[PDB]
């Protein structure tokens, strides 16, 4: 399936709700602060 996976890779190459995302990625920084 390597050529099929290569076609998948080409389509991924051309490939190019958020409060919880914000809080998580900020939670990492405050954990680093405490450490």
């Amino acid at each position: 399936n390597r050529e099929l996976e290569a076609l998948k890779q080409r389509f991924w190459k051309h490939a190019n709700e958020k409060l919880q995302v914000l809080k998580a990625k900020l939670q990492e920084a405050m954990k680093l602060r405490r450490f």
């Binding site: 190019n16 939670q27 405050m30």
Partner: protein
Amino acid sequence: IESIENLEDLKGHSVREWVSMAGPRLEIHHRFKNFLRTHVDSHGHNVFKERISDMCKENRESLVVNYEDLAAREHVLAYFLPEAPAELLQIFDEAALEVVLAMYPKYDRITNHIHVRISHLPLVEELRSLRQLHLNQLIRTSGVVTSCTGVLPQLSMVKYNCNKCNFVLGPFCQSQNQEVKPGSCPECQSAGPFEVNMEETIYQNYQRIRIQESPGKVAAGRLPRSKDAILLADLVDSCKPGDEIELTGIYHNNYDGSLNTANGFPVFATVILANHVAKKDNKVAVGELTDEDVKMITSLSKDQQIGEKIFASIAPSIYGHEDIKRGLALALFGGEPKNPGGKHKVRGDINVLLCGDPGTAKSQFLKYIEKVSSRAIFTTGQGASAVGLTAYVQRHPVSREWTLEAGALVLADRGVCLIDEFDKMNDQDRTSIHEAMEQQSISISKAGIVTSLQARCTVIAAANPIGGRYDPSLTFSENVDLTEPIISRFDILCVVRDTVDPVQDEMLARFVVGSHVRHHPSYGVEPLPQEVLKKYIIYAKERVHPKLNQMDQDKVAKMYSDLRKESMATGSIPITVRHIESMIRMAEAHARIHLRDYVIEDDVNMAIRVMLESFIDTQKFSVMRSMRKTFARYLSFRRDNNELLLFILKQLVAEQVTYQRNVPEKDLVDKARQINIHNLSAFYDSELFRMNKFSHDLKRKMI
């Protein structure tokens, strides 16, 4: 109150009560004070010292904080801010007041409260996507303002006179939820018809706006959703009906019996408590410009090739059309309105007409001007009306009295009105713009309304000739189908042709294919970046005002006289008196491009060149060459004057050699200021001294 080393451990609380209690409140207060005092940008410059200083210079009572900076510098405040926005914004306002009164101890005379506004919040939401999950949270939305109340006074801390005795009831806080009922007087227990003490009551500005989804973001054939938003204090008149805005605010809900009886279910009304309004039009205001920005602009103005750079920056993806780029640059920067004696107004805006063949980038030029300019209105042909262009009267939507409303020309009052497919309009729609084009006003006498609105805009129109192909066998007047009153209202009148020329076709093809390569999703002089150009434009328009001292009246007067003669001869274009005032306007526009506070003969010669070249362009083929030699030999295409400085240099060298035998650059420039040939940089770039083996150096000053 001991300092709290970890705000992040809520210890089972929710954010609202956790920040409402005293310990975390003081910790948040100190953290925000420290953030304001110590936050620095990538260059190490303390940004908030500058911002607070500008706010106190201009008495603005409001401080915009970038959420990206807050999140980068102090994490937990950015963490708690969207969760409990009212509480943390109150704490931020207190802390900002402390810092402001540390910087300016006497600012309490100007304000008693500093409003912290939040910008660039990542919690962007579509209006159609707001849910109950966003309630009491700081959201950010986009839309077009479709309604606005007048700025109304609202009770904020109200006091009531007792209905019998002379006592005054204590301060009650207004909530946005319901009317505050006083209760009963604590001196005597009466509860009768109480009345507001106007003098002791504290009021605040109130304005209720309605925003809806922008018409290009709604689907075709689908009705737009809308929200009410409350603007308080210095946020009032941040926008007008028609403005595209981004709105950061608290999404708030309260019980409404009217909605409950309308729906049959306990539905709660919703409103946005606005915290920050930013017009998507004015991405950069004049107040947003930093000392770095204005230093960049002023230093960039000293390049001395800046005119060519500014011209080249007009639509950098369009090959050629240097005359179009020149005319559009002059129109975009604009002249100065004048009113000698207070009784004779003359417009300062420059109007442009691009007529010519299909596939010649006229519409692309118009869309570029739309993108780059603040306050751009774009309209097309049959899509416009007389009424819609100028102004329209309607029954008011709720109260049903006749009310006047702003058309495109009024909405573009200090901006650009762009009219594509200009020849395709109706005559009745096209004649509406005459008053706005010349007198810069729109006078309406309809349904009891009798008034004149300001329409001081610059009109940039695009058109095709008759049959959709320009004919060099005929003059402009013979193939345009427009009439003299509208033709004369356009200062700059451009003809664009698509004639075959193989070398130019090859270069144009290479430029176009290179553009398609460059812009994939992934002339000589070099342009500015478009961000820098926008900042430069607004600085040049708002912070600079050219003034004309002299313009060598004989030259322009003789030019106008024989331009009138040749226009009467060929019939190509009416010249009237407007072309003279177009000369003054174009000179002021070029001075503004160079950021000159005073107009000079450089600018006058530029304006002269633009007028003469466009008039020559209006002619037929055979007539065009004779007209070229006529106006070129007799009138002023003052390209350069190197010979005078050449022989001045030769004379000075000969005298110096004669003196020494039996600082020359200082000698040369002294003579160059004595004679009216002051533009010496052209001579230093030209070949005439170079092949005569002279040279220059600003340090050594030897030649």
